[PDB]
Amino acid sequence: PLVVAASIIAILHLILWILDRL
Ligand SMILES: CCCCCCCC/C=C/CCCCCCCCOC(=O)[C@H](O)CO
Ligand SMILES: CCCCCCCC/C=C\CCCCCCCCOC(=O)[C@H](O)CO
């Protein structure tokens, strides 16, 4: 469960960082 949480959160960070760069 914690792995899943951390992974979702890391991925959302990635998505939001990429969108900000674009
Ligand atoms: C029997 C099969 C059952 C399947 C199990 C249920 C699966 C439910 C699926 C959920 C997928 C939703 C993912 C969230 C996408 C949002 C991207 C977030 O993007 C962003 O961060 C914004 O674009 C920022 O502006
Ligand atoms: C700025 C926007 C930030 C958005 C933050 C999103 C955080 C991610 C949200 C939830 C992570 C929960 C993981 C779910 C696994 C199931 C837990 C339950 O698992 C279990 O073990 C059962 O209870 C017992 O079988």
Swiss-Prot record:
- Site for Seems to be involved in pH gating, residues: 17
Transmembrane annotation, as ranges: 1-19
* Annotated site, Essential for channel activity, possibly by being protonated during channel activation, and by forming the channel gate and the selective filter, chain positions: 13
According to its UniProt record, where is this protein located? Virion membrane; Host apical cell membrane
Briefly state the protein's biological role: Forms a proton-selective ion channel that is necessary for the efficient release of the viral genome during virus entry. After attaching to the cell surface, the virion enters the cell by endocytosis. Acidification of the endosome triggers M2 ion channel activity.
Any domain commentary?
Answer: Cytoplasmic tail plays an important role in virion assembly and morphogenesis.
Quaternary structure annotation from Swiss-Prot or TrEMBL:
Homotetramer; composed of two disulfide-linked dimers held together by non-covalent interactions. May interact with matrix protein 1.
* Miscellaneous field: When the channel is activated, one or more imidazole moieties of His-13 probably become bi-protonated.
Which family, according to the similarity comment?
A: Belongs to the influenza viruses matrix protein M2 family.
What name does the UniProt record give this protein? Answer: Matrix protein 2
What organism is listed for this UniProt entry? Influenza A virus (strain A/Hong Kong/156/1997 H5N1 genotype Gs/Gd)
Gene that produces this protein: M
